[PDB]
Write a protein that binds this DNA or RNA. Structure first.
Ligand SMILES: [Mg+2]
Ligand SMILES: [Mg+2]
Ligand SMILES: [Mg+2]
Ligand SMILES: [Mg+2]
Ligand SMILES: [Mg+2]
Ligand SMILES: [Mg+2]
Ligand SMILES: [Mg+2]
Ligand SMILES: [Mg+2]
Ligand SMILES: [Mg+2]
Ligand SMILES: [Mg+2]
Ligand SMILES: [Mg+2]
Ligand SMILES: [Mg+2]
Ligand SMILES: [Mg+2]
Ligand SMILES: [Mg+2]
Ligand SMILES: [Mg+2]
Ligand SMILES: [Mg+2]
Ligand SMILES: [Mg+2]
Ligand SMILES: [Mg+2]
Ligand SMILES: [Mg+2]
Ligand SMILES: [Mg+2]
Ligand SMILES: [Mg+2]
Ligand SMILES: [Mg+2]
Ligand SMILES: [Mg+2]
Ligand SMILES: [Mg+2]
Ligand SMILES: [Mg+2]
Ligand SMILES: [Mg+2]
Ligand SMILES: [Mg+2]
Ligand SMILES: [Mg+2]
Ligand SMILES: [Mg+2]
Ligand SMILES: [Mg+2]
Ligand SMILES: [Mg+2]
Ligand SMILES: [Mg+2]
Ligand SMILES: [Mg+2]
Ligand SMILES: [Mg+2]
Ligand SMILES: [Mg+2]
Ligand SMILES: [Mg+2]
Ligand SMILES: [Mg+2]
Ligand SMILES: [Mg+2]
Ligand SMILES: [Mg+2]
Ligand SMILES: [Mg+2]
Ligand SMILES: [Mg+2]
Ligand SMILES: [Mg+2]
Ligand SMILES: [Mg+2]
Ligand SMILES: [Mg+2]
Ligand SMILES: [Mg+2]
Lengths: 124, 180, 262
RNA sequence: UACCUGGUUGAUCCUGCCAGUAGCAUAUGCUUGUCUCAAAGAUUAAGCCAUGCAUGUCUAAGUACGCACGGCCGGUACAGUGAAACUGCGAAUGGCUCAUUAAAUCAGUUAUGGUUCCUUUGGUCGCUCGUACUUGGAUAACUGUGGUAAUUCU
RNA sequence: UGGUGACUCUAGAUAACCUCGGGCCGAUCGCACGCCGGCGGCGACGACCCAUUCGAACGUCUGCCCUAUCAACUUUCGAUGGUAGUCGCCGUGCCUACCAUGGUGACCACGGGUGACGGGGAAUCAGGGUUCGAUUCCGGAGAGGGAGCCUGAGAAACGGCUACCACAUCCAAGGAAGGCAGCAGGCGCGCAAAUUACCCACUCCCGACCCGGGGAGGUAGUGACGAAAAAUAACAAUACAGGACUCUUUCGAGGCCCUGUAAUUGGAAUGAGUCCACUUUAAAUCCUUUAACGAGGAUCCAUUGGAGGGCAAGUCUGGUGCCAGCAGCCGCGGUAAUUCCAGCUCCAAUAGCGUAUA
RNA sequence: CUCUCGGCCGAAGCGUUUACUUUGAAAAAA
């Protein structure tokens, strides 16, 4: 019941299709608010669904009163899917990486650097 | 190459003659009265003041009418005022050279807490600050040597998180209450 | 080094870009283009730093590929494409139109403009050469080269160019009693009226300029840029009227702004 | 902070160095709870080097007849994703080190009216009076037959 | 016609020239589909040549450490200048041909040395200096040593190639392949220096490209090079022990200040740690946020040097007896050692402190 | 210090030349 959302710098990008802003949080007793919570409070301010909003970079000040971050709120889910850097989509679980390491595709790369045409595909 | 800042300074200088009765006694007194940790803390202050005295001395050779003397001087005096050392009567340039160590050892948070009578001994104070019971405005300060600005002095508190002003009891009262 | 250099170290970037030591080893290295790199702005500095629109290089990239940004009415999809003094950035989506002028302090500032005024720019004429069947040629500071100009246009004259047709509408001749900005130098970003121009053969030509506050200073002729006829500038001026300030008075500017704030 | 003490003589004043005293970097001995920063195979051997990686690249817009996929509707020249290969571009930057190098490098200063310049930006691109509703041959991937202990061989 | 401080400039007119180891004039691609059998909108590549940008390359003026146990130097083989060329991208003894006999030097040439890459800078400093700058920015050089070229706008390129020298790998003995002064890591050298870690999220770069790639870079690990903040206790009572102000002729009294020591009591306060969850982040880590536990004696204990003088601090106590030993220097040690070896004490700086060396 | 043009003042001159001095502009960022 005691948690407070204020929004400091605020701007609208017509060109990224988003409401892009700074998020302030008052949480005097508690440990830092989890993001899945803060999205809800934030959501009910701008009346939009939870889905479409992305908060990050939360930092808590010494002595435990306040927390500062960024958030950005997209018009359509889809716009988000295009415009958002992917890892953030992945914290929501929309986008999924490939689990191959760097040594992996590096090795495979130098392997098929050694053969001619159709044979390249036969290597892994 | 890298993305890193290399800048740093030394915050103090160690005296030329290591052992002299005079220095040792005077600096011991300074240590005791304000409850400092080691001779370093004294040299630290002594050095920060020393810089100021150098700036001033190298303004004083310049003519009054010079833009730089006027501007740079007014800045220096202003900082020196708002920390609480100088007054606005004495706000001329030369009264700077009239400054002593004690004056900065005044405006340390450690001593301010003991002057405002929040803590009952100087050392009790140094503990109290480090123990996070102390706060400035809404801000909690963990450092004994935090120079307290003139205007920020009027609010120095017991920090609503703590037992003292903020009504939750500590570990110790908790245990004695769980036995009884 | 064998051949040309493609990187720019962050620290050696041009000062007035205002970059930080902390966030990288490099900086943008403006692509080759119309304005000299030392002098100019890259689109990515301007768009993500001055304007704050984009946070990172990548968000910017996503901006230029929706082909939003137009420089002089044409889409530039290159993010490091240099814009420079006296240049127009049009963003159609926000209806925002920026011209690039120098501050008093010598930095490019964000300066907003009427959609009307955005339809033209000023240029300096760097040289005049005749070529190919006696046809006269203009070269601006923008590198725009223009043929069949009015024979009355001589060197160091300003032209007004329609950005649509790329054709000169009318021009201002370089003379005492006209109104200029210093483009690069110590005095960069200042505005005044030409008092005097002294000529040293075999060297730089020295120009004296006087303010609206009556202060005077010199530059090299190449650094002068003639904005207006008599006392009245053709372009909109930036918020700072283009007159510098002794530090001392600027401090009091700030202070009065602190006492009137509340 | 514009600073000096001990040491020659039985004692004294000197010249005078030795020693002390404070920083600063490299090493090193002992010790070490907390947090923020952060240098780090330069000196001697620009001595030697296993192994892995450090430079690749496709839009709608240069070449697709790989069924590799699917793909629909199937005489549609070519629907579409697309490995490979040809083509284009890049590999001259960046990274490392300090052997050489003493008006050389280099710094400020100037010049190119004494030259070259991928690219980018703008200019030009029916100014020439004399099979085109489209031209010629080859080659790679691919198919196959191979060689050599050995290769990013052919 | 136009332009410069100045052209053998730019533009114009005339005669011709034009390389088969050829110069320009688009035999090309996409998306929309529309108009009166014809017409065309936007783009993508191309392209000779101007101009421009990034440059690059040669020149100008002034500036460098030590050395005379280097005083004359260069010129038959270009030294200095002249004239015509060749070569080059052009200016030039750059190179050839022919002439001239010059050019440099105590204002230090020429030669040698440098534990010499040059700067921006660093350390130290009253004023003046001295020393250092391999090292993150700028410039130069180099990729085992030399040399020589292909390709190209651009290399005399080394994660291209061709030799020779030095090294070293494979071999079926015919042959083949090498270049860590990129990142890691290994050997050797040494007084002397980190993980065969995770990443393209940031910063920028390259590409036909919004999409791919990057040991450039970023992030962790190791890190007492160095720099910043900063714990190891605070409080109260007593118990005294003491001391200063007040009262008393003194005895004494004081509820008034302080201080120590308390194998005195007392609960209050916290971080170190352990540790749920959040946050952090490309994924983690740390910090910060926060629940839960977590402080009374050898514990959750501070060490390094010192204790004759310089120089701060012992005429202690026991051992040694010109030995072992200390001692930077002056000195100490030969049976009462304020200097050794130790126990006690105290003294200096303090999460630091000693040694050696520039 | 002085004359030829332009709107009594600017461009044109020179005065022997330097050193010294003050002033301007140029001096990458870190
Ligand atoms: Mg390089
Ligand atoms: Mg000139
Ligand atoms: Mg004697
Ligand atoms: Mg004696
Ligand atoms: Mg000495
Ligand atoms: Mg902690
Ligand atoms: Mg080495
Ligand atoms: Mg060396
Ligand atoms: Mg290829
Ligand atoms: Mg290109
Ligand atoms: Mg073009
Ligand atoms: Mg085959
Ligand atoms: Mg000649
Ligand atoms: Mg010649
Ligand atoms: Mg000859
Ligand atoms: Mg050397
Ligand atoms: Mg040096
Ligand atoms: Mg260096
Ligand atoms: Mg290194
Ligand atoms: Mg370098
Ligand atoms: Mg090289
Ligand atoms: Mg080697
Ligand atoms: Mg090329
Ligand atoms: Mg080579
Ligand atoms: Mg290599
Ligand atoms: Mg290379
Ligand atoms: Mg290595
Ligand atoms: Mg060893
Ligand atoms: Mg080390
Ligand atoms: Mg990246
Ligand atoms: Mg990518
Ligand atoms: Mg690296
Ligand atoms: Mg670590
Ligand atoms: Mg150490
Ligand atoms: Mg430290
Ligand atoms: Mg920790
Ligand atoms: Mg305890
Ligand atoms: Mg001890
Ligand atoms: Mg002893
Ligand atoms: Mg002593
Ligand atoms: Mg003593
Ligand atoms: Mg010693
Ligand atoms: Mg001694
Ligand atoms: Mg010492
Ligand atoms: Mg500077």
């Amino acid at each position: 019941d005691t948690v407070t959302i204020r929004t400091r710098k605020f701007m609208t990008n017509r060109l990224l299709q988003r409401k892009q802003m700074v998020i302030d949080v008052l949480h005097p007793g508690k440990a830092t608010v989890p993001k899945t919570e803060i999205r809800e409070k934030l959501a009910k301010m701008y009346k939009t669904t939870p889905d479409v909003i992305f908060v990050f970079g939360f930092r808590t000040h010494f002595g435990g009163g306040k927390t500062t971050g960024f958030g950005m709120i997209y018009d359509s889910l889809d716009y988000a899917k295009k415009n958002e850097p992917k890892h953030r989509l992945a914290r929501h679980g929309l986008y999924e990486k490939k689990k191959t390491s760097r040594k992996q595709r590096k090795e495979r790369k130098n392997r098929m650097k050694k053969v001619r045409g159709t044979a390249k595909a036969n290597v892994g | 190459p890298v993305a890193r800042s290399w800048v740093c300074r030394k915050t103090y200088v160690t005296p030329r003659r290591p052992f002299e009765k005079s220095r040792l006694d005077q600096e011991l007194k300074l240590i005791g009265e304000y409850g400092l940790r080691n001779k370093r803390e004294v040299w630290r202050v002594k050095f920060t003041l020393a810089k100021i005295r150098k700036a001033a001395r190298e303004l004083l050779t310049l003519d009054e009418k010079d833009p730089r003397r006027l501007f740079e001087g007014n800045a220096l005096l202003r900082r020196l005022v708002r920390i609480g050392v100088l007054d606005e009567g004495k706000m001329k340039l030369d009264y700077i050279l009239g400054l002593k160590i004690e004056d900065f050892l005044e405006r340390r948070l450690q001593t301010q807490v003991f002057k405002l009578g929040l803590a009952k001994s100087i050392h009790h104070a140094r503990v109290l600050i480090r123990q996070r019971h102390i706060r400035v405005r809404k801000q909690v300060v963990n450092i004994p040597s935090f120079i307290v600005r003139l205007d920020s002095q009027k609010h120095i508190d017991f920090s609503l998180r703590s037992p003292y002003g903020g009504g939750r009891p500590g570990r110790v009262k908790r245990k004695n209450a769980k036995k009884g | 080094a064998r051949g040309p250099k493609k990187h720019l170290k962050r620290v050696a970037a041009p000062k007035h870009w205002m970059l930080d030591k902390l966030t990288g080893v490099f900086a943008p290295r403006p692509s080759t283009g119309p304005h000299k790199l030392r002098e100019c702005l890259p689109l990515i500095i301007f768009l993500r730093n001055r304007l704050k629109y984009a946070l990172t290089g990548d968000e910017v990239k996503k901006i230029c590929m929706q082909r939003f940004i137009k420089i002089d009415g044409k889409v530039r999809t290159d993010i490091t494409y240099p814009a420079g003094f006296m240049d127009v950035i049009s963003i159609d989506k926000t209806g925002e139109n920026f011209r690039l002028i120098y501050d008093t302090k010598g930095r490019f500032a964000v300066h907003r403009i009427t959609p009307e005024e955005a339809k033209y720019k000023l240029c300096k004429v760097r040289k005049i050469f005749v070529g190919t069947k006696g046809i006269p040629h203009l070269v601006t500071h923008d590198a725009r080269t223009i043929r069949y100009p009015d024979p009355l246009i001589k060197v160091n004259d300003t032209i007004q160019i329609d950005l649509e047709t790329g054709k000169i509408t009318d021009f201002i001749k370089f003379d005492t009693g006209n109104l200029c900005m210093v483009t690069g130098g110590a005095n960069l970003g200042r505005i005044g009226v030409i008092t005097n121009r002294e000529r040293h053969p075999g060297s730089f030509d020295v120009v004296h300029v006087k303010d609206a506050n009556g202060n005077s200073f010199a530059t090299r002729l190449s650094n002068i840029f003639v904005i207006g006829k008599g006392n009245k500038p053709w372009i909109s001026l930036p918020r700072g009227k283009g007159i510098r300030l002794t530090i001392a008075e600027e401090r009091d500017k700030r202070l009065a702004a602190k006492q009137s704030s509340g």
